[PDB]
């Protein structure tokens, strides 16, 4: 009824919130094996500080009583038990519902997702992992990126609690590779990776093929969703960020960041481990179905922007990262055809090595 | 000294119920503090509840510090030294990130307190002796530091943002918030006399208090400081009789009315005579403001605006207005000289 | 013992406000490379409210008006001699 709506809709610390929440997952986890947009909607809403009307003034602002109300909801979640209550609410908070205050609750949802990793909530992580499975990458990795900004810009730390919460979660920790190789696109200078979220990663690495299989044991995968719903095997943002060493020069004076290479060029290395058990999970047991790994065809628009992001002087001051990048594409290439990652023939990249500076890594590739 | 995730939760509990929940008392305003700092010291998406709690407690050490002041809580000296050596290694760490929101959130603080607590305490020109009165106490102190240090570190990349959301809140905030961009023009000149000059440019515009509100400013940044005003107000008057009536208000002008004397040839006659279709009413204001100022105020080598005057009077439209204006400044000093009949004039 | 020489430290600050007047970079030069004694100085003597404010930072006829009145107006010799005096 809306009488309880109404006894809801009084302070940001309010408990009825908590209270309406936990209600309405009951409801929803007893109607689960028999089986409203509103109700999600409006709770949303509450959380984000926007009225019942739809041209109200705010739900009390924030202060204090919207970090009671958070820490509450917080509380609440790691002692909910519930995979799929947790999975729905976390999916109902921070989905676009196109209200006034649909970003700023997206960003709170991405906030209190950050506590919970910060309070080892690992069911609640987990919950969200899935939850951003269930969401579009362009939100997802946009929340991680602001997530991962907020985190790693403070003082050390920030990186090994990340680090830890990856040992411990393998499905958030591919979740989190993936958001940084969308992130780190190499598309501008804030497409190169910072030092400590690079350092994270980096390190991060021992497991990194152990995760990756980890992703794709959870569950089976179903044809390409829309705009991708996070999927597990970031290999050409790897194989990229490897290639994009002078891209930082490239793209800033000039020689601004020059002394990634070397660490990109490591946590590149980690893809053997993971082309070799790739291979063992599809080639030698029963997964050798499909396309042998999520490719999505996206090998031919890696390429393409290799050639379009390389013009940047690339003759002479820039040779040796040129040719040493052509190497490392041929590597991953491959790598990806040993392993079967890439079931197309040649000529889908042969083809694309025609309006990339020549080398002989060129020719290695075509050989 | 890093915290467990249950201490954090603890610390959560304890900050936010107000009593940590093992002892199950309530926590003081010191060991709020603590946690806030702890806090600070971690979880950025968190430090909301972090910006609203140094609100809250500085908003009490104020109360406390300037309450003790004027009838001349416990001493919160360490915590604060503490809290401006951390938010100073933040701003040396990574300015961008910290600097707008935090900048923000103080300058909104600080404007509130002084609307709220100024003129209406014990005991609270004397803009100057009530900024020695706000640096008697040292929280106040301290934030003006650390607001400096954000402005030395937001030189090159957007100062103009950060001067435009200070004069912003002193207008919300007026004429109380004055004491503290007084402050910052000693400190810093150039933008802070420039958007002064533009915001009286603009309240004569809007009137054709806050006129006052900038007078004061400028008097408060006269300081060895007034050549850039003088060079400030030059180039507006190269473009405006909003600096006669600064003038009329503010004495210390009349420095710049020493250069302004040889500032004008016939280009400025010609400028003068562009101007000249201001209406008889604006034009009586006009002359008036200027008899008073070089009657009331020249205290300088007059002499030369003197003989500027009646060379003038030896273009045209220009030569009869001043010896107009020439004859009714005399009229003006007989009405200073012989009056009030006993202490004298000057 | 810088308590009787309050008249002194007056000239000598007028000396500094001059001095940073005209020449206001060889002032900064100067006060910045002696900043340590100066600062011990301001921290020592409590009682230098001057240096303190100078450091952070960077009479008339009003009141003679009655005694040239009378000086001018003075005839007898005991108006003379009183004003004079005072």
């Given at each position: 009824m809306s009488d309880i709506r109404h006894s809801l809709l009084r302070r940001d610390a309010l408990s009825a919130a908590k209270e309406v929440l936990y209600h309405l997952d009951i409801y929803f986890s007893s109607q689960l094996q028999s089986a409203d947009k509103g109700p999600v909607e409006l709770l949303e809403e509450f959380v984000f500080q926007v009225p019942k009307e739809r041209s109200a003034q705010p739900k009390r602002l924030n202060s204090l009583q919207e970090l009671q109300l958070l820490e509450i909801m917080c509380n609440y979640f790691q002692e909910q038990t519930k995979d799929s209550v947790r999975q729905i609410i976390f999916s109902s908070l921070f989905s676009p519902q196109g209200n006034k205050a649909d970003d700023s609750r997206m960003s709170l949802l991405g906030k209190l997702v950050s506590m919970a990793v910060a309070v080892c909530r690992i069911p609640v992580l987990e919950c969200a992992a899935s939850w951003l499975q269930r969401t579009p990458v362009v939100y997802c990795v946009r929340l991680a990126k602001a997530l991962v900004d907020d985190y790693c810009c403070l003082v050390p730390g920030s990186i090994q609690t990340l680090k830890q919460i990856f040992?411990?979660?393998?499905?958030?920790?591919?979740q989190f590779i993936t958001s940084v190789t969308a992130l780190y696109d190499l598309s501008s200078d804030d497409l190169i990776p910072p030092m400590d979220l690079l350092e994270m990663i980096v390190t991060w690495i021992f497991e990194d093929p152990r995760l990756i299989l980890i992703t794709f044991l959870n569950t089976p995968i179903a044809a390409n969703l829309p705009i991708?719903?996070?999927?597990?095997?970031?290999?050409?943002?790897?194989?990229?960020?490897?290639?994009?060493?002078?891209?930082?020069?490239k793209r800033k004076g000039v020689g601004m960041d020059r002394d990634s290479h070397l660490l990109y060029s490591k946590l590149h290395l980690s893809v053997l481990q993971v082309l070799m058990t790739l291979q063992l999970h599809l080639t030698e047991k029963n997964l050798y179905g499909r396309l042998g790994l999520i490719l999505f065809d996206h090998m031919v628009p890696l390429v393409e922007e290799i050639n379009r992001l390389a013009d940047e002087l690339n003759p002479l001051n820039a040779s040796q990262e040129i040719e040493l990048s052509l190497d490392r594409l041929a590597q991953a290439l491959q790598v990806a055809m040993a392993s079967g990652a890439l079931l197309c023939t040649r000529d889908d990249l042969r083809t694309l090595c025609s309006r990339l500076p020549h080398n002989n890594l060129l020719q290695l590739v075509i050989s | 000294a890093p915290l467990s995730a249950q201490e954090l939760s603890q610390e959560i509990k304890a900050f936010l119920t107000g009593v940590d929940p093992i002892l199950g008392h309530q926590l003081s305003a010191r060991e709020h503090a603590?946690?806030?700092?702890?806090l600070l010291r971690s979880l950025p998406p968190a430090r909301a509840a972090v910006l609203d709690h140094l609100r809250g407690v500085f908003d009490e050490s104020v109360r406390a510090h300037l309450a003790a002041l004027d009838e001349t809580g416990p001493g919160l000296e360490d915590v604060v030294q503490e809290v401006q050596q951390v938010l100073s290694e933040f701003i040396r760490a990574n300015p961008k990130a910290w600097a707008p929101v935090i900048s923000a959130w103080s300058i909104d603080l600080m404007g509130q307190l002084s609307s709220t607590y100024s003129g209406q305490h014990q005991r609270v020109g004397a803009l100057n002796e009530l900024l020695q009165l706000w640096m008697g106490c040292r929280a106040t102190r301290t934030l003006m530091d650390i607001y400096v240090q954000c402005l030395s570190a937001l030189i090159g990349s957007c100062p103009d943002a950060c001067v435009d959301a200070l004069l912003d809140t002193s207008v919300q905030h007026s004429p109380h918030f004055d004491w503290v961009v007084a402050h910052i023009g000693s400190s810093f000149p150039g933008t802070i006399i420039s958007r002064v000059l533009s915001c009286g440019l603009k309240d004569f515009c809007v009137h054709g208090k806050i006129a006052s509100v900038v007078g004061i400013l400028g008097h408060l940044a006269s300081r060895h400081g007034d050549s850039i005003r003088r060079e400030l107000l030059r180039m507006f008057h190269d473009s405006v009789p909003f600096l006669l009536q600064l003038a009329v208000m503010s004495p210390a002008l009349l420095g710049t009315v020493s250069g302004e004397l040889?500032?004008?040839p016939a280009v400025l006659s010609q400028l003068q005579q562009h101007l000249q279709g201001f209406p008889r009413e604006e034009l009586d204001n006009m002359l008036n403001l200027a008899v008073h100022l070089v009657s009331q105020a020249s205290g300088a080598g007059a002499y030369r605006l003197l003989q500027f005057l009646v060379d003038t009077a030896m273009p045209d439209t220009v030569r009869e207005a001043c010896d107009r204006l020439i004859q009714l400044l005399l009229l003006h000093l007989q009405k200073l000289v012989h009056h009030r009949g006993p202490p004298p004039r000057l | 013992s810088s308590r009787h020489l309050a008249a002194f430290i007056n000239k000598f600050v007028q000396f500094i406000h001059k001095y940073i007047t005209y020449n206001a970079p060889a002032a900064i030069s100067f006060l910045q490379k002696h900043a340590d004694p100066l600062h011990d100085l301001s921290f020592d003597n409590s009682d230098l409210v001057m240096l303190k404010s100078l450091l952070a930072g960077l009479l008339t006829a009003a009141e003679m008006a009655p005694y040239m009145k009378r000086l001018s107006r003075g005839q007898t010799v005991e108006d003379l001699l009183e004003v004079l005096s005072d």
């Open positions: 040992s411990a979660s393998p499905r958030f920790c591919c991708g719903f996070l999927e597990l095997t970031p290999l050409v943002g790897l194989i990229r960020w490897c290639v994009k060493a002078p891209l930082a020069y | 603590r946690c806030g700092l702890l040889v500032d004008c | -």
